[PDB]
């Protein structure tokens, strides 16, 4: 559907720029300070995710209702995947590189009160190291995450979504073979990377549970949620936890 050297050019050109959390690293870390900063980081990243998705070819040809649905449900996965890439490129996946001014070591993972989820996210980052994911594969795979979760009743124009998603799957397939392999080695690589994408979903589901817990207790825990974060978490996350969405896997 779209030439392989062109696709990578478009994806590189629209890739969001670095965003800082704005965290005061001179302060002592508390659960509330770290979680509020992550909430603030998510709001800042979410603004870039919308601008990014709008520039993804074919996305804005969806009905605006479906565009809302896709961003509302997939923003967690897109951000966690990009975070794993950042940790791979910056600290060789030894720490969680949420932002240049918000890097989690073991101490911050403990005081965040989601230590086990942080460990799971570092394991995801380590898969980048073991697989030696290219930047070209990363960009194609991240684009696919916009097409990873849909309502159980489907979208307004499900058929167009189906073909656009199939298209972006083909783009990943073509990028892998574009890089010199035999067809056997390219077929294994496609399975590895799609299995990597599917491994995101259990992590994302736990993160959706965790963020709804924080939101419910935000006042008592002194954990602040920015405005757009609150609008999505108070609307689409409950539907996710109610089983009203389905992940679109590969394996």
């Amino acid at each position: 559907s779209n030439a392989i050297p062109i696709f990578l050019s478009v994806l590189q050109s629209i890739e969001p720029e670095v965003v800082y959390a704005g965290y005061d690293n001179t302060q002592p870390d508390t659960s509330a300070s770290l979680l509020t900063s992550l909430n603030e980081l998510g709001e800042r990243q979410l603004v870039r995710v919308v601008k990014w998705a709008k520039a993804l070819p074919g996305f804005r040809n969806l009905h605006v209702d479906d565009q809302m649905t896709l961003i509302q449900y997939s923003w967690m996965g897109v951000m966690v995947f990009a975070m794993g890439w950042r940790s791979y490129k910056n600290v060789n996946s030894r720490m969680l590189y949420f932002a240049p001014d918000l890097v989690f070591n073991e101490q911050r993972m403990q005081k965040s009160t989601m230590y086990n989820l942080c460990v799971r996210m570092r394991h995801l980052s380590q898969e980048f190291v073991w697989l030696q994911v290219t930047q070209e594969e990363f960009l194609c795979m991240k684009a696919l995450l916009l097409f990873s979760i849909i309502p159980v009743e489907g979208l307004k124009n499900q058929k167009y979504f189906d073909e656009l998603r199939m298209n972006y799957i083909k783009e990943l397939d073509r990028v892998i073979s574009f890089q010199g392999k035999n067809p056997t080695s390219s077929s294994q690589r496609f399975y590895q990377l799609t299995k990597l994408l599917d491994s995101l979903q259990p992590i994302v589901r736990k993160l959706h549970q965790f963020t709804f817990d924080l939101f419910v207790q935000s006042q008592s825990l002194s954990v602040e949620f920015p405005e757009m974060m609150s609008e999505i978490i108070s609307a689409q996350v409950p539907k996710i936890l109610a089983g009203m969405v389905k992940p679109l896997l590969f394996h």
Partner: peptide, 9 residues
């Protein structure tokens, strides 16, 4: 609103 505001820009 808000997410819709960003998409309509």
């Amino acid at each position: 609103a808000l997410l819709r505001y960003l998409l309509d820009k």
